[PDB]
Write a sequence for this structure.
């Protein structure tokens, strides 16, 4: 009955998506041809008369070199070929080109396949979109993707899983230019929106998973485990079951603030799993470490508004509420005085499943915390400084302006970003 | 004869009902298929209080299971004793309440309130004469408490002179597991004070204290917590279906408990609870068990009567027991501990005795005591509701759903009226 | 009254014996290929009835009572074997002179 | 009928009472499981003084185990008679005192006194008519003397009209095995002089001196020391549980032994102690009991009545015996050694005869003697408390926990006045 | 549930935690894989659900040459990977390098690891540490080690096992400068503090154990027996029990006097075990001899301030209290006038365990004595003679000042230690 639609936008969306959909098939025991050798698969797969399953995913891309690798590999028989949407020409790291020039040629094809998938749904819990701030139409076409979804669909959930531009490492020069102009869309047309930046995931894989040389496949296996633990309360029985709309309402203090931080615990190797036990209290303390956080910001600087936790495995409610008491006793961590009861707890019996060839090991007890802090103002004023530092001498403006957008729209992104950072300042003051 | 229709609200109501009908079907000797396999004729002599006649020597419960997410509903039907319920009573919505009172009271509950009122009126007409109802729910979520407050308020006006029993699980400070949890409780208790006959105050936090210190549970899952709440529900209304020396049904236990119509929130406790090791050293006699009913460790609420005044007490005993002891021990408590007990009401304690014991036991007793110490649990909820509402926490999830902002202010003012009213009786 | 107590004890012993049969069946089915991973199962069956770290009481039916009274923690008491020799009370009485 | 609730404090207390609770269990014929395996009817007639009724015809001792360390709480479980105690009475904590009096009395032991006071009230208010309590503790330890004096000082206000027996284990000059042993002892006698009815002075040096010179044992373990303490403790409360020709309860021994309420320190002793080689060369006879009874070798304290005066003397007998040989022997020792007994009390001694002897034996005797010669005990402790305190020894281990330095001044001044009160009665 | 976290620091620390943790494994019958072929192991080992006993030790070093032998040798699979901490460059025989410049880089990394062990502890008796005065990390980082556990864990126990310079032989030249500058740290930030110098352990093996050429392994076993018998009453049942809280109280009369002298008896070879009888009397007289004393100072010049006794094996309180009487009658042993009864006695049941390669013999009874004396000022005044002799011409002063510490701390730590020798002498004067 319950079901969602995945919208993998961009080259990062495809590499994330095939990491997620590889994990889903082995989780539900479905072969690459789609036929198995119970309604757990109903949330993402669609049943036909012949015994197959079609994933409810739409791949949004503007370059054919990233779709044809999907159509050639092992999963060529899995996905329906009309779900993979390829543009004729890439915007090539341009928000403006994917907003006014390139994106309106295939905006009709995306909304048509959205209509077909939502027609098959008997009741639609929400949408998941996957994209990155850095790229052109991963940030650009996503901006006009939300405009059509919000107007057509009123109160349907639309989750925005994003990748923030890292403060130090980058693969572009116009990367801060693309990120700030997407603040207009996400502030207005997003029910929820996560972010993890790549520099933080770089620190964890070096020291926790014991990998000298990882690529984006080992990062996207980690991000697949985050989404799997989120949606498994929809797919499997739980001692406490938490739906998609449940923790959506319970983490946001204001409609202007819908930006949690995601962390996962434990992340250890199969040789280090031979040594250390993994209990409920041991994995609870690991989510509060600023080293193991998956965003380069320190909650020790800021203040927690609310907390959402997602437990999986041999998890007893006795040990959950015992470890919460220990965390409130330590004075290194703080909570705002206007949220005394800030936690939310969910438990599922099924342990997380592992992928063959992956880096992690199979674990009984795991937790995926969703905490909203005032430490996100640390990673915004840094990017607002660098967006102001480049734009002081008026650089790269001729490429964006000449494509159709006026020069005053850059100044519009200044005040909306300046006002949004002011709304996070008034949260942290105590009454 | 005197019949009770059972109502369950939400996921917490459905899990509570699953064990409650599991423990009393074995009490009446009912197989998983629903037939009768009995040993004594007294088991079938009163079965129409909670069951219905069916063709072929079968009996079905008179219960309706109401929630909004069908995921937990299939756990009830595919459970151990879920094949006995009639399928028309499973009344379910299509989307959740969002842990929101207003979604269950204004937005989505207004459509499901018509379905439950159609079913419950077709079942309340079947009996001889309607004694009353029951309601099992929790105040932590919006499914059980959102429309649960709305379904009571519509059926109270339709049935003006009846008995209305509600099982409330009010939020706890230590084992709080919801951010919007005081918003659910404080604005919903306004419906439990003006349109409800009786209410029991359960705390999950007190349930772990009993299961960890006393009952010796290494892993106390919600099944064993649900065992205690159902055993408390069984012991209160065992006089409905079983004869005794001195009996007291639900109506006679109620009118002697409530001195004023707006004071109907009690604290339960149960007494003969022991572990695997301490079973042998304990002797099951009357003065042994009356130590543990009044013991502050075995309360089913997170309030301490030593800080307050016992206003009216009940005790429903069970088993073949001598009436002299049931009376000399209870007057012994009243005279020795003369500081807590009120002075303006002498002979505070109500008394009931039943003959047949629970299986595996020879003697049992149930404690129900109303005091002024319940205002500990009410002021603690009130300050956490006032703290969030000063900066308007989560206001957009309730204002835009069909209700204004002044409904919280009258919720706080009426909540202030109740806690100040408890002081002047102290 | 004495007959009732004996009946209750016999019923509890029968239930524990049924569990022991089921657990032995599961361990024997699982240990067909290798015995490298049967150790948590052996620990689970050798845990003992109740939270008991001390020796079982054979005359009592194998009961293991617990001792958890430590503020809010309630930590169970540990168990240590003694190198000190076991003594008989009759021999201690004769040796100390109360014979 | 007249009942005594036993108390146990410390590692010394947990090992004194562990041997003590199995010699009554042999005395009344009780198996380690708990049931009754007896031969006569007189054993089961008066058994409710120390035992409590359970289900299935089983009996549990009415004692509580108190300690601040879980280390020796294991050894009382895995002992010969560890399964016979109910687990709810095993009171223990997490942080010990570490051979300090200050930790037990104010800082660490004040959180355990409120836990055990709840326990002792449940096992006292359930009884018909208490005679009183009994304590075992040591002044050479932390939890025995630190918080053990806090149990003494608190239950006096709760139950003023009762009795309180204690077997104090005061330190020894030669068998001193604690550096701060006088600080524990000196600050606790001031608590014993005010809030204690009867006091027995147990010295382990006296226990070794008996075991070598009289009993001829090469390996005197603490089992042989705890059995000697239990044999005196069993034979001093005999006549409550066993009828006699001239019976005497512990209250009758109290009223005849303390002519002034601060003069309540005694000397215990036991009648037949004899090696295996010397067993066949003596005959159990009434003069043979009282000949060895006043012998200074068999005193259970480290002080000799030749240096002082027998202020008041007891005699408690066990076994089938006559009245003239009890009376003619003891008037003989009153007359012949007339220089030791005081002059201002004639007929200094109370006598008592009980019928049932201890098992394996047919005659016995017990001694309680209040004297001025026990001030030899107090002067040696107080000369060494001032010896350490003149150089401010170990003062940071006591001052920083909350208690000021003036408590040292009053504790040695009060103990100096008590010795000066003893002297003017000599 | 009580337990002790061993904190070894230095190349001395790694080599002494190599022999101490070899003794603990065979004492509780634990294979080098960490799995056994009772709860006595709970003080030093941790229980994974799979059944592996992971030690709760923190090896600290600033050079990788001695840590990497642990990861290669027999016990590679026993020790947990994150518990062995290694810096980049060593302080190289320097207080100043290990304190203000080099040692401040891993002070965050080590004390993150004690959090993972202390939060696992439901009840902690206290921390044990091991350090050497001669080294750089043993002198520099160890002085920042005691300063921040004092802040983080207020009233916890911090026992010390220190290595002091020998009176004549030495393995360094600026070793006296390292020794004095840590006197202030082990004064205000140490609870109890034993010291052992190697020359007084060199002289034992040549005449008692009959070893012609001992090396540091033949010494590291002997200090391992001392730490065993101190904590043996925590682990094992006894007729009388003593704890780390107890012997702190009955040995330390003043907070400025917390420096015992640690002995052991008997230490005899397998050929002298066949011949000489070992009763309780014949082992309690060996702790009073000056030849068996383990510090290069003689109590015959000083005053026995307090005494602590630890007994192991088939020991009876009859023989303990008989031989305690005899040693008190003799006049070569003196007590102060204000400690008339200065003894503390502890008794355990299991005899100490013999290890493969240990040159001692399997023995029934043993004793370990901690007798605080005034004669510990004998060894201190000899070194302060050599510190001021070395500081007379201001040699080696350029090495310390430029690192970050000032030259005013040179006169401070000598004047701090000057008044401590006066306090230790005024106690011995009778009234
Ligand atoms: N976390 C994460 N980020 C990725 C991954 N792949 C790409 N990115 C981000 O994507 C940004 C660049 O966008 P692209 O990978 O080119 O894809 P795009 O967003 O559609 O941009 P275009 O190719 O120009 O259409 C970089 O700044 C990266 O930060 C990935 O696998 N994981
Ligand atoms: N008692 C004793 N001392 C040792 C032993 N091994 C090394 N030492 C001491 O170690 C000191 C030398 O410093 P190291 O421990 O080797 O190295 P460090 O402490 O890490 O300091 P750096 O060399 O600067 O890194 C010498 O003064 C020795 O006294 C040993 O086995 N027993
Ligand atoms: N006593 C009891 N409380 C429960 C149980 N399950 C959940 N709860 C409590 O109920 C609250 C959430 O209830 P919820 O599932 O949202 O109820 P619903 O809104 O009616 O579906 C939490 O605070 C839990 O502590 C149960 O089985 N027994
Ligand atoms: N008579 C007697 N003395 C004991 C016993 N156990 C210990 N002691 C003495 O008590 C002292 C140690 O007692 P301790 O353990 O500190 O007592 P606690 O602090 O109250 O637990 C030693 O000097 C022993 O001689 C016992 O069972 N009987
Ligand atoms: Mg693109």
């Amino acid at each position: 009955m319950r079901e969602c639609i995945s919208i993998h936008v961009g080259q990062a969306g495809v590499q994330i998506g095939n990491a997620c959909w590889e994990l889903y098939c082995l989780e539900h025991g479905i072969q690459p041809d789609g036929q198995m050798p119970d309604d757990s698969f109903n949330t993402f797969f669609s049943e036909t008369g012949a015994g197959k399953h079609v994933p409810r995913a739409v791949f949004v891309d503007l370059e054919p070199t990233v779709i044809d690798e999907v159509r050639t590999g092992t999963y060529r028989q899995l996905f329906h070929p009309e779900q993979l949407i390829t543009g004729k020409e890439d915007a090539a790291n341009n928000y403006a080109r994917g907003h006014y020039t390139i994106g309106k040629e295939i905006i009709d094809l995306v909304l048509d396949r959205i209509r077909k998938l939502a027609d098959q749904c008997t009741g639609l819990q929400g949408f998941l979109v996957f994209h990155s701030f850095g790229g052109g139409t991963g940030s650009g076409f996503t901006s006009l993707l939300m405009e059509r979804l919000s107007v057509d669909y009123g109160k349907k959930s639309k989750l925005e899983f994003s990748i923030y531009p890292a403060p130090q490492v980058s693969t572009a020069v116009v990367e801060p230019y693309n990120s700030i102009l997407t603040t207009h869309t996400t502030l207005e047309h997003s029910d929820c929106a996560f972010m993890v930046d790549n520099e933080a995931i770089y620190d964890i894989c070096r020291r926790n998973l014991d990998i000298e040389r990882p690529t984006y496949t080992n990062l996207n296996r980690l991000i697949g485990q985050i989404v799997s633990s989120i949606t498994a309360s929809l797919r499997f029985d739980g001692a406490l079951n938490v739906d998609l709309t449940e923790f959506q309402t319970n983490l946001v203090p204001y409609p202007r603030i819908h930006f949690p931080l995601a962390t996962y615990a434990p992340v250890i190797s199969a040789e280090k799993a031979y040594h250390e036990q993994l209990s409920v209290a041991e994995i609870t303390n690991a989510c509060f470490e600023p080293a193991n956080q998956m965003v380069k910001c320190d909650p020790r600087h800021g203040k927690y508004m609310a907390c959402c936790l997602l437990y999986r495995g041999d998890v007893v409610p006795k040990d959950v509420n015992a470890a919460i008491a220990t965390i409130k006793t330590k004075r290194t961590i703080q909570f705002v005085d206007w949220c005394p009861t800030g936690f939310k707890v969910g438990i599922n019996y099924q342990p997380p499943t592992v992928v063959p060839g992956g880096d992690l090991a199979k674990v009984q007890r795991a937790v995926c915390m969703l905490s909203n802090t005032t430490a996100i103002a640390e990673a915004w004023a840094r990017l607002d400084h660098k967006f102001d530092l480049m734009y002081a001498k008026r650089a790269f403006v001729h490429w964006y302006v000449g494509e159709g957008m006026e020069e005053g729209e850059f100044s519009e992104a200044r005040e909306d970003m300046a006002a949004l950072e002011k709304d996070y300042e008034e949260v942290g003051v105590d009454s | 004869m005197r019949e009770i229709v059972h109502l369950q609200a939400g996921q917490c109501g459905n899990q509570i009902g699953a064990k409650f009908w599991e423990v009393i079907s074995d009490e009446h000797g009912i197989d998983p298929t629903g037939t009768y396999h009995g040993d004594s004729d007294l088991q079938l002599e009163r079965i129409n209080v909670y069951y219905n006649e069916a063709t072929g020597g079968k009996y079905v419960p008179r219960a309706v299971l109401v929630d909004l997410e069908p995921g937990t509903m299939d756990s009830v039907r595919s459970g151990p004793f879920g094949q006995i319920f009639r399928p028309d009573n499973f009344v379910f919505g299509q989307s959740g309440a969002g842990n929101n009172w207003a979604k269950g009271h204004y937005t989505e509950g207004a459509e499901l309130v018509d379905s439950v009122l159609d079913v419950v009126r077709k079942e309340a007409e079947s009996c001889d004469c309607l004694q009353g109802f029951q309601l099992t729910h929790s105040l932590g979520g919006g499914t059980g408490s959102g429309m649960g407050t709305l379904l009571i308020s519509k059926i109270r006006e339709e049935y003006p002179d009846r008995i209305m029993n509600t099982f409330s699980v009010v939020p706890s400070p230590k084992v709080s597991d919801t951010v919007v949890e005081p918003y659910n409780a404080t604005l919903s208790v306004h419906q439990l004070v003006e349109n409800t006959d009786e209410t029991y105050c359960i705390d999950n936090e007190a349930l772990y204290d009993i299961c960890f210190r006393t009952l010796k549970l290494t892993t106390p899952t919600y099944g064993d917590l649900n065992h205690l709440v159902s055993a408390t529900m069984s012991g209160v209304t065992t006089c409905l279906r079983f004869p005794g020396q001195l009996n007291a049904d639900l109506r006679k236990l109620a009118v002697n408990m409530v001195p004023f119509p707006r004071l109907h929130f009690f604290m339960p406790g149960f007494a003969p609870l022991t572990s695997r090791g301490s079973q042998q050293y304990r002797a099951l006699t009357v003065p042994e068990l009356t130590q543990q009913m009044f013991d502050a460790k075995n309360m089913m609420a997170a309030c301490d009567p030593r800080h307050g005044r016992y206003l009216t007490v009940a005790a429903v005993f069970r088993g073949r027991m001598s009436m002299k002891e049931v009376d000399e021990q209870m007057l012994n408590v009243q005279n020795k501990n003369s500081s807590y007990f009120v002075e303006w009401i002498p002979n505070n304690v109500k008394t009931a005795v039943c003959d047949i014991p629970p299986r595996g036991l020879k003697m049992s007793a149930t404690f129900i005591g109303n005091s002024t110490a319940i205002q500990e649990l009410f002021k603690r909820i009130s300050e956490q509701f006032t703290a969030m509402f000063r900066r308007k926490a989560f206001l957009h999830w309730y204002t835009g759903e069909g209700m204004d902002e002044m409904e919280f202010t009258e919720a706080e003012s009426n909540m202030n009226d109740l806690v100040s009213e408890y002081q002047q009786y102290q | 009254e004495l007959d009732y107590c004996r009946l209750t004890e016999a019923l509890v012993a029968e239930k524990e014996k049924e569990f022991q049969d089921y657990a032995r069946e599961v361990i024997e089915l699982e240990s067909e290929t290798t015995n490298k991973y049967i150790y948590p199962l052996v620990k689970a069956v050798q845990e003992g009835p109740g939270g008991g770290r001390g020796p079982v009481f054979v005359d009592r039916g194998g009961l293991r009572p617990s001792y958890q009274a430590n503020d809010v923690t309630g930590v169970q008491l540990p168990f240590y074997n003694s190198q000190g020799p076991k003594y008989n009370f009759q021999k201690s009485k004769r040796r100390l002179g109360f014979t």
